[PDB]
Design a protein around this ligand. Structure first.
Ligand SMILES: CCCCCCCCCCCCCCCCCC(=O)OC[C@H](CO[C@@H]1O[C@H](CO[C@H]2O[C@H](CO)[C@H](O)[C@H](O)[C@H]2O)[C@H](O)[C@H](O)[C@H]1O)OC(=O)CCCCCCCCCCCCCCCCC
Ligand SMILES: CCCCCCCCCCCCCCCCCC(=O)OC[C@H](CO[C@@H]1O[C@H](CO[C@H]2O[C@H](CO)[C@H](O)[C@H](O)[C@H]2O)[C@H](O)[C@H](O)[C@H]1O)OC(=O)CCCCCCCCCCCCCCCCC
Ligand SMILES: CCCCCCCCCCCCCCCC(=O)OC[C@H](CO[C@@H]1O[C@H](CS(=O)(=O)O)[C@@H](O)[C@H](O)[C@H]1O)OC(=O)CCCCCCCCCCCCCCC
Ligand SMILES: CCCCCCCCCCCCCCCC(=O)OC[C@H](COP(=O)(O)OC[C@@H](O)CO)OC(=O)CCCCCCCCCCCCCCC
Ligand code: SF4
Ligand code: SF4
Ligand code: SF4
Lengths: 393, 189, 369, 73, 145, 111, 204, 60
């Protein structure tokens, strides 16, 4: 028993074996009495090298790879990985493929905020609705399994011409059933924290990132929106026919964990509105009605048109990423998941940089653990919505 | 000055009423039917697109390599020798290592002869890793049908429950997916 | 047996009929109620683990540990037996004397405190004139095995966890002592037979929970923080919890000592503030309504079984309330639970003791004698 | 018949009920109404498991609460 | 709870190839594999769907051709015949070799008939193909199917 | 901080073992050939692995005491152990509990 | 040699338990370790979320007996639920070595069987967890759905019920202990825990 | 020789099933269980049926 008792500040490891859903990162914090003096986050325990793998993969065979950065909302990763050769070659997508993309991405945003919400309520001390959040996440899983074939990650759904396959025969009805089921659940999740004074005491002023300090540290998504900035890339960039709906970006003015909670809950409440307004304005409606209308009305009459297709010229596997560079992005569940692609008229990219949504939000974690206590560490790490596959990639 | 004593007792009784209310509403969770899909006797049906174990047909194979050039890791070991008596490609011993496979079915889409199909089979656990090297006759086997096992009550998950149903446990007798199919509006309109 | 039923007297008389001494017959009688009470504590820890894994599943809309027996009934037993089969670990400079003794020091007085609990009048091991005070004194030995298990591991976060568990476990000894002190005021003694006997007079109206409405709450909240349960215990406080170095039978000792403390504390809520064995109707009222004497052996057997069922109903109800309240309450951190122990439960226990002393002085016929 | 022997007879009858008969009745009650039970009925049958637990432990390796084989027809 | 003796080894020595019917929840038939291993047998537990063309995998040399991940060539690996290599690399006074196939489902009737005839022809080789299902552990000979 | 290279069949552990504890020493490093017994290890091939390890740690003189160089030494020793297993001087265990062939299946030499 | 990676002939090892009492006690031992099977709450990547989908309510983790443990000292099983990198591999071997001896490993997903999609062009991915740990059951599927994981657990239970109690001794480590003196230069600890208090954050 | 042959088109008629009114392509016949290939969708699915729940079509 060689543990002595000094008067100097100690060091707490919080190593890569996290006994909860916290990823693989070390969190070597000092914390002299209780005040966290210093915090060195060790990163890279899931660094598998996607940026070097990408330079030796065709885009049709890198789509199975891109579910593994943000592996709670997997298709968001495909939403940049498809959109990077899409805007070099200028390949247009159909309107139906764009609306299917909007529906899949907003379901992925709901699922990403649910997988954030489970561990966040378990870390803040609620720990009763942890087992009730995975039920609606399994509803989204079974919605993804009908269309994309797999659950939350391993979808080959997004393609350069749009979407790999159109929806199944009962998909729109069951998605509307899930939204009618899920509208009161976000109000229950908001009243769980905000109508309980012990939780808002645990979440007020815990992590005090400013408005301009959030812009300087490169924060994005709900960590930027909670500081005061109305910056959503679906609105800033006129992206993938998101402007055909009426949703409002949720912001808060404080920037603490309660503000990030409120922004993510209202992001769920806005994404389900986008789901409803996209299911209403789906070109051709559900796939059973559209397939019946293109069956009975010959092979004509605008239901065989371009913007009523699921795929815009299904491409050969030897598609050349043309010479030129740009930087695509999406607003994922953590915001600003970007791809810097410098393809040079080869079948492979020449450089595929991944700008992860939470690798640039985890660098503020030592800055956010400055004047905080010990038991407010896992709350602040809970409020970042960190997924280490994107941080390491 | 008893303004902080009565506030103290008020905070105590408000927490006591909150604990009593939460204890009443966690006692209304026990009466609900459990949503547990009890696996070895209630194997849930996978969807019509599942991407489970890959199936291979040794006679429908023109011995190209499109299933290798679209696989993300160039996994299927197809080897052929050219027979100049016939001047075709003449595949022998196709195989896929399912311990390396990521089950994306890229090889299923980019198959020009519809040779590679994908199955509903996912129970592929082995003791030896090298048993996951399914050769052409191993993966040419008929897959395990979940609805044809006389120990399983199979369960449709969520996207095959009709139009108001959330869990597939209360299903009375095989009610269908959501409603009509494209052979109905052609008769309707 | 004819006049009554006395298994101690009948056993000593039938063992003197073989040709033994009287004191030797008493000595051979001695291990039998102790073995019966250890059997009761062992079935209590198995019931507690089963009820913990089944009510927690029923709350979360799951099914509990099936496929281990018919229901999950053999699920704790395997969880016992597996921990007998696992090896030792000895964390890298561990003390090897204090390490093995820590679980023993923390679970021996909890087992020893089962003399105090009755399942009926003279259905216990001993009356023990300082009963519940000896239970409190023996439960005060737990934050020495806690500090022993914290120190004897060569890693930190368990020394820190040991100091944390010892600071939690002494913050609720004094409200427990004050809440027991109110019942000892109202009962004119500390023996649990006399504590239940001052409640088994009018069946349910003479129970102490109506005369100690806040003392029952103080005892229940303070006993739920002595058993390491509910809020007072999903990432750990820091990384570890004073038993993250214990692997086999020593972790089994910790694991069974927690639930044995839970079962004992539920039994003592049933004994102190409720009737320990009393039906809500007094038993002599039913004995005079039937007309048969309260000394003939079949009414003795029926009333003993009825007292055992009443004890187990109330002990089960409080074990059920603990397993519900584990998922009801929010988990509080260490500072809020120490503020609950010192700044809330201690002043409410003190004002409860003062008002029950004023009530016993003012109205002595309702509160004891 | 001796009354000591009849007291030992009702002891043996109570032991055979507490260990064998009513634990089998509780097992036959739990493959019965378990989901049709309410919360209070679930607490009552959990009490029935709690009280007759040594008899349920004796009868545990002899009950076969597995689902029956399906018909496939 | 069903104290099982050593009748299972006697039915194995009688039939030569018996189909097991195990409950699908887990390990309730491995007690019979341990009884069989305690009588002097050597059990070889391997998964049946990973084997292909049991005439070639069990008793013949078969080229494995492992996975090149776009890096190596085809690189055929000639695995030895499993039953005869595990029977020759055995003690000479052992009771024999037993192939314990854990997935008797998703196999054909022809492979069952071949496994039964293979246990009949070469002397010390028995199979315990687990076709699964039944509510208790019960076994039949591999005669009709 | 104990410097080590723990993979299967070799454990480097820069330091010396005392009783069941390895104490971190600077100028020595241990070796734990096959701590899980997948291979048989007769004494001839065991002495061959010991001599190859001492040659590898002599050839690694002058570099840093990082875990990268320890992992390089352990990986070269892993390739040597697999080369001895492939030559036939070392067999698989077959009394183990796993039997998963982590260094290749048995196979005949030519065809 | 005519067999390239050969198996070896054993020493004719047989327990020959003709006793039926100790055979039934072996049955009790295997059933007890079989029906408890407490896994380590071990994650590291994508597959862990499907592992978490077992711990939820739709598929039940507990109904085979297994509750997840935080410490590896109480852990009976480890389901390696994700990609093991070159950085995570010594940590994984350490948290496997910190378990009591009747321990079991399930290589979950393709990343731990062979390092599935990182087995081609990755420089920091361990191609298979059996390069580090003795593995009992291998589990394919890139995200293996939770029915497949509690199929791997069923096959692990079939593996556990075979284990003999007289055969304990395969749970050993069998030290070899070749010590060599080396001439490498010790470097200082590069990663200390000084991030904001380091005298380079304050001023350029 | 008259029974269900591989290579033709089918359609399922088992009413209480997930796969209903689905046209498929029969691919392999072993031991009575018929495995048919479904072209519907981007990934070709192979779902096993039996002859008691299948019937060939005459139109295509
Ligand atoms: C755990 C393992 C269980 C042990 C194996 C199974 C044993 C089953 C046999 C039960 C015997 C009946 C118990 C009894 O009548 O106990 C009688 C004896 C003697 O008790 C006498 O009882 C008399 C009457 O007292 C009672 O009546 C007084 C009022 O007159 C008091 O108020 C108080 O109620 C109570 O003390 C005397 O006063 C003395 O107390 C005492 O001499 O106790 C004793 O030996 C107790 C001996 C141990 C009994 C443990 C099991 C009892 C719990 C399960 C019972 C369930 C049976 C019914 C199930 C329902 C089926 C439909
Ligand atoms: C093995 C055989 C043991 C039975 C022997 C009888 C016995 O020695 O046992 C009887 C003795 C006491 O014997 C009594 O002893 C009395 C004499 O009293 C004297 O003797 C007693 C000690 O013997 C005391 O000292 C007492 O103060 C003193 O007055 C009577 O004359 C009788 O002889 C007799 O009734 O001890 C007891 O009562 C033990 C308590 C038994 C009742 C509890 C049964 C509960 C079973 C269900 C468990 C499942 C639930 C668990 C909890 C789950 C919670 C969620
Ligand atoms: C009593 C101790 C006797 C020794 C027990 C041997 C191990 C039994 C077994 O493997 O199945 C386990 C069975 C449960 O399933 C049981 O398994 C039995 C065997 S079966 O599928 O044919 O497995 C089955 O008949 C039975 O209905 C079913 O409840 O019983 C047990 O749990 C035995 C342990 C209980 C007490 C030990 C202390
Ligand atoms: C009789 C007791 C009289 C004592 C009155 C003291 C009042 C003096 C002010 C006391 C005072 O000011 O200092 C006590 C202090 C709280 O006040 P603060 O100093 O922190 O407030 C900050 C100041 O700036 C404002 O005054 O510490 C606490 O947190 C404990 C009190 C709140 C605890 C709230 C929860 C407790 C009740 C929960 C009950 C749950 C159990 C029921 C479950 C069923
Ligand atoms: S793509 Fe299809 S046809 Fe071509 S080799 Fe692969 S399986 Fe055969
Ligand atoms: S499913 Fe994907 S990973 Fe598997 S062989 Fe086909 S293309 Fe390759
Ligand atoms: S196997 Fe697939 S899902 Fe699992 S960790 Fe690897 S990439 Fe992620």
């Amino acid at each position: 028993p060689k543990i002595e008792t000094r008067t100097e500040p100690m060091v707490i490891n919080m190593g890569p074996h996290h006994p909860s859903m916290h990823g693989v990162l070390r969190l070597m914090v000092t914390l002299d009495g209780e005040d966290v003096i210093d915090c060195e986050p060790v990163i890279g325990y899931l660094h598998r090298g996607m940026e070097k793998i990408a330079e030796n993969r065709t885009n049709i065979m890198f789509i199975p790879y891109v579910s593994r950065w943000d592996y709670a909302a997997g298709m968001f990763n495909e939403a940049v990985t498809v959109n990077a050769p899409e805007k070099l070659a200028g390949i247009p997508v159909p309107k139906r493929a764009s609306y299917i993309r909007v529906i899949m991405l907003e379901l992925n945003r709901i699922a990403n905020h649910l997988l954030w919400l489970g561990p966040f309520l378990a870390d803040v001390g609620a720990q009763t609705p942890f087992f009730y959040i995975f039920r609606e996440r399994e509803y989204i899983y079974d919605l993804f399994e009908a269309a994309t074939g797999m659950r939350f990650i391993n979808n080959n759904y997004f393609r350069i011409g749009g979407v790999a396959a159109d929806l199944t025969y009962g998909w729109v009805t069951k998605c509307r059933d899930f939204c009618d089921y899920f509208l009161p659940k976000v109000d229950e999740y908001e009243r769980l924290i905000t109508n309980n004074p012990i939780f808002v005491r645990r979440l007020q002023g815990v992590g005090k990132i400013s408005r301009e300090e959030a812009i300087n540290w490169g924060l994005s998504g709900p960590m930027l929106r909670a500081s005061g900035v109305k910056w959503d890339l679906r609105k800033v960039d006129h992206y993938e026919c998101y402007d055909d709906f009426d949703w409002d970006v949720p912001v808060a003015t404080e920037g603490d964990c309660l503000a990030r909670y409120i922004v993510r809950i209202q992001e769920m409440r806005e994404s389900v509105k986008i789901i409803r307004q996209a299911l209403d304005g789906l070109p051709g409606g559900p796939y059973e009605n559209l397939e019946a209308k293109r069956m009975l009305e010959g092979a004509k009459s605008e239901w065989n048109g371009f913007d009523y297709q699921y795929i815009g010229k299904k491409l050969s596997p030897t598609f050349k990423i043309p010479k030129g560079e740009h930087y695509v992005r999406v607003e994922s569940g953590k915001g600003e998941l970007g791809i810097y692609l410098i393809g040079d008229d080869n079948v492979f990219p020449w450089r595929w940089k991944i700008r992860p949504p939470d690798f640039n939000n985890l660098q503020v974690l030592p800055q956010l653990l400055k004047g905080m206590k010990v038991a407010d560490i896992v709350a602040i790490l809970g409020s970042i919505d960190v997924i280490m596959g994107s941080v390491d990639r | 000055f008893l303004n902080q004593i009565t506030n103290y007792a008020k905070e105590a009784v408000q927490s006591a009423k909150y604990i009593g209310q939460g204890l009443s509403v966690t006692f209304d969770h026990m009466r609900r039917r459990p949503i547990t899909v009890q696996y070895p006797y209630e194997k849930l049906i996978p969807s019509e697109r599942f991407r489970g174990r890959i199936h291979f047909e040794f006679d429908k194979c023109i011995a190209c390599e499109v299933c290798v050039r679209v696989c993300p890791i160039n996994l299927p070991v197809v080897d052929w020798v050219f027979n100049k008596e016939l001047k075709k490609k003449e595949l022998k011993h196709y195989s896929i290592d399912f311990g390396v496979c990521i089950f994306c079915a890229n090889c299923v889409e980019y198959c020009p002869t519809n040779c590679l199909s994908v199955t509903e089979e996912y129970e592929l656990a082995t003791y030896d890793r090298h048993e996951l090297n399914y050769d052409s006759v191993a993966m040419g086997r008929i897959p395990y049908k979940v609805t044809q096992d006389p120990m399983v009550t199979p369960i449709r998950e969520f996207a095959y429950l009709p139009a108001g149903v959330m869990s597939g446990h209360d299903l009375p007798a095989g009610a269908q997916r959501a409603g009509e199919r494209p052979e109905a509006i052609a008769n309707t309109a | 047996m004819e006049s009554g039923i006395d298994l101690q007297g009948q056993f000593i008389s039938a063992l003197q009929s073989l040709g033994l001494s009287h004191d030797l017959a008493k000595l051979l009688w001695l291990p039998l109620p102790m073995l019966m009470m250890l059997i009761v504590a062992t079935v209590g820890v198995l019931v507690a683990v089963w009820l913990e894994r089944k009510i927690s599943a029923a709350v979360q809309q799951r099914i509990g540990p099936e496929y281990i027996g018919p229901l999950g009934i053999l699920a704790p037993l395997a969880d016992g037996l597996k921990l007998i089969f696992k090896e030792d670990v000895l964390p890298a400079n561990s003390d090897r004397w204090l390490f093995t003794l820590g679980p023993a020091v923390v679970v021996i007085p909890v087992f020893l405190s089962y003399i105090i609990v009755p399942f009926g009048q003279n259905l216990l091991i001993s009356n023990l004139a300082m009963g519940v005070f000896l239970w409190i004194a023996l439960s005060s030995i737990a934050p020495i095995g806690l500090l022993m298990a914290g120190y004897a591991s060569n890693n930190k976060y368990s020394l820190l966890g040991g100091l944390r568990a010892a600071a939690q476990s002494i913050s609720y000894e004094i409200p427990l002592a004050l809440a027991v002190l109110a019942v000892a005021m109202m009962s004119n003694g500390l023996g649990t037979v006399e504590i239940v006997e001052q409640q088994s007079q009018y069946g349910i109206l003479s129970w102490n929970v109506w005369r100690q409405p806040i003392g029952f709450l103080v005892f229940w909240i303070a006993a739920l923080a002595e058993c390491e349960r509910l809020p007072f215990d999903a990432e750990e406080e820091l990384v570890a919890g004073y038993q993250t170095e214990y692997a086999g039978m020593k972790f089994a000792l910790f694991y069974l000592g927690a639930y044995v403390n839970l079962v004992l504390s539920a039994l003592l809520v049933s004994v102190l503030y409720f009737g320990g064995w009393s039906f809500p109707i007094p038993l002599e009222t039913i004995a005079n309504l039937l007309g048969v004497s309260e000394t003939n052996p079949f009414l003795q057997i029926a009333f003993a079984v009825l007292g055992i069922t009443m004890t187990l109903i109330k002990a089960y109800f409080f074990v059920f309330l603990a397993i519900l309240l584990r998922w009801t309450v929010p988990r509080v951190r260490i500072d809020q639970l120490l503020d609950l122990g010192w700044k809330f439960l201690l002043p409410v226990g003190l004002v409860n003791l003062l008002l029950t002393a004023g009530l016993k002085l003012a109205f002595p016929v309702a509160f004891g004698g | 018949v001796s009354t000591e022997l009849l007291v030992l007879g009702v002891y043996g009858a109570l032991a055979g009920l507490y260990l064998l008969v009513v634990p089998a009745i509780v097992y036959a009650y739990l493959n019965a109404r378990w989901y049709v039970a309410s919360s209070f009925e679930r607490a009552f049958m959990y009490f029935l498991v709690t009280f007759f637990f040594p008899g349920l432990l004796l009868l545990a390796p002899f009950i076969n609460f597995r689902p029956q084989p399906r018909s496939l027809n | 709870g069903l104290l099982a003796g050593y009748q299972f080894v006697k039915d194995l020595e009688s039939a030569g190839a018996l189909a097991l019917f195990v409950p699908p929840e887990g390990g309730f038939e491995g007690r019979y594999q341990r009884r069989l291993r305690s009588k002097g047998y050597t059990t070889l537990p391997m998964s049946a769907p990973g084997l292909g063309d049991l005439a070639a995998y069990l008793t013949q040399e078969h080229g494995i051709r492992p996975a090149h991940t776009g890096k190596e060539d085809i690189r055929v690996y000639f695995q030895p015949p499993l039953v005869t290599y595990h029977l020759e690399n055995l003690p000479p006074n052992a009771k024999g070799l037993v192939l314990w196939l854990i997935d008797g489902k998703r196999l054909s009737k022809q492979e069952f008939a071949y496994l039964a005839q293979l246990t009949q022809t070469l002397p010390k080789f028995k199979v315990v193909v687990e076709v699964g299902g039944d509510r208790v552990v019960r076994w039949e000979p591999l005669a009709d199917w | 901080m104990l410097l080590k290279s723990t993979t299967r069949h070799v454990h480097i552990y820069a330091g010396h073992v005392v009783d069941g504890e390895v104490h971190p020493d600077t100028e020595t490093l241990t070796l734990n050939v096959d701590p899980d017994n997948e291979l048989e290890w007769n004494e001839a091939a065991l002495a061959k692995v010991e001599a190859k390890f001492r040659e590898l740690v002599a050839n690694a003189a002058g570099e840093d005491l990082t875990e990268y160089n320890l992992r390089r030494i352990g990986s070269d020793l892993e390739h040597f152990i697999r080369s001895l297993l492939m030559q036939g001087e070392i067999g698989y265990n077959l009394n183990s509990r796993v039997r998963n062939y982590s260094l290749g299946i048995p196979r005949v030499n030519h065809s | 040699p005519a067999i390239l990676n050969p198996i070896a002939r054993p020493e004719v090892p047989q327990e020959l338990a003709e006793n039926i009492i100790l055979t039934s006690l072996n049955d009790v031992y295997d059933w007890a370790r079989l029906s408890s099977l407490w896994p380590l709450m071990y994650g590291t990547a994508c597959c862990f979320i499907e592992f978490a989908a077992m711990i939820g309510s739709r598929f039940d983790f507990d109904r085979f007996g297994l509750v997840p443990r935080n410490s590896p000292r109480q852990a009976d099983l480890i389901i390696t639920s994700g990609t093991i990198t070159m950085k995570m591999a010594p940590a994984l071997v350490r948290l496997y070595e910190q378990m009591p001896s009747p321990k079991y490993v399930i290589a979950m997903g393709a990343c731990t069987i062979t390092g599935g999609m990182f087995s081609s062009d990755s420089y920091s991915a361990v191609r298979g967890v059996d390069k580090l740990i003795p593995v009992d059951v291998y589990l394919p599927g890139c995200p293996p759905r939770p029915e497949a994981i509690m199929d791997a657990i069923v096959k692990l239970r079939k593996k556990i019920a075979n284990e003999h109690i007289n055969e304990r001794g395969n749970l050993a480590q069998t030290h070899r202990l070749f010590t060599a003196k080396h001439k490498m230069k010790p470097v200082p600890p590069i990663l200390t825990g000084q991030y904001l208090n380091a005298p380079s954050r304050q001023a350029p | 020789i008259m029974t269900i042959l591989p290579g033709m088109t089918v359609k399922v008629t088992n009413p209480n099933d997930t796969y209903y009114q689905f046209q498929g392509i029969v691919q392999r016949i072993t031991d009575g269980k018929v495995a048919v290939l479904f072209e519907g969708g981007n990934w070709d699915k192979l779902v096993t049926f039996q002859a008691s729940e299948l019937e060939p079509v005459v139109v295509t």
